[PDB]
């Protein structure tokens, strides 16, 4: 009757909540995040960072990501930290990834204050958030990436915790676009009308091999990189299934560890956010948290 779309995780799934905390020591809402500790109270919680999907367009949707995936993470026993990032329309790449990295230095540096054990900081996201999650899980320890004559600052200088590591320990990628060389028909780059074109500054990806390489985490997968779980629906009409197939193939051929879960009849979210696959995520994140 009076209806309210779910805003953040349900109230009974957490004991403690800090909302609209800035992680960049500035005044931008694109640089805020929210933190939730489980109901089952403990001395410390290992942490999972989450990122909304939005074709990189949104800068204010951390409550959607919380509402979608936060409850199973809280019930599994992890602190859940949901972040904002800047819109592709207000800062082109690498801005989004510098935001994620800054958010990570924030969580790790201040873990104690939030009763976070920084022993483990996993990361997850859906769609473009899954992209950003994955881009972090293949760039632990990297401050710039260069392709041809193009150089991008991945770590950035955002905020006041630059000495703290900006690394993540495990990744769950929910149907993210991770191979932009093959987004069109799964064989080619898209044209300049698409969200990756805006991400690289309204250039035609078909003309920009270097930009396309440096927004595509599939290009940096290494044997030693943190393990990853990839979940994609085989009827996804927005980001094609082939993306996740490719990412898994690359993890497999580089000597790294990827699990790929394909969701039959799964849309771009629909059918994928079932108990079954939330469990795949929480089981994964638990095994990683303990190993």
Numbering used by the authors: 2 to 292
Task: Quote what the paper states about this structure.
The BD-FAE structure belonged to space group P43212 and contained one molecule in an asymmetric unit. The final model of BD-FAE was refined to 2.06 Å resolution and it contained the residues from Gln2 to Glu292. In the crystal structure of BD-FAE, a sulfate ion was bound to the active site, which originated most likely from the ammonium sulfate containing crystallization solution. It mimicked the binding of an acetyl group to the catalytic triad. Looking at the surface model it can be seen that the active site was solvent exposed and formed a shallow furrow. The N-terminal tail (Gln2-Pro7) protruded out of the core protein and packed against an adjacent symmetry molecule in the crystal. Such crystal packing did not form a closed-ended dimer but an unusual fourfold spiral shaped polymer, in which the active sites pointed to the center of the spiral. In crystals of BD-FAE, the protruding N-terminal tail packed as a β-strand against a small β-sheet on the surface of another molecule, leading to an unusual fourfold spiral shaped polymer.
BD-FAE, a previously unknown protein encoded in a metagenomic PUL from beaver droppings belongs to the functionally diverse α/β-hydrolase superfamily. We demonstrated that BD-FAE removes feruloyl and acetyl groups from simple model substrates, acetyl groups from birchwood glucuronoxylan, and feruloyl groups from highly substituted AcFaXOS from corn fiber. The His-tag was not visible and the N-terminal tail showed weaker electron density than other residues of the protein, most likely due to its flexible protruding nature. Overall, the BD-FAE crystal structure adopted a typical α/β-hydrolase fold, which was consistent with the above mentioned BLASTp results. The active center contained the conserved catalytic triad of Ser128, Asp237 and His269 and the oxyanion hole was composed of NH-groups of Gly53 and Ser128.
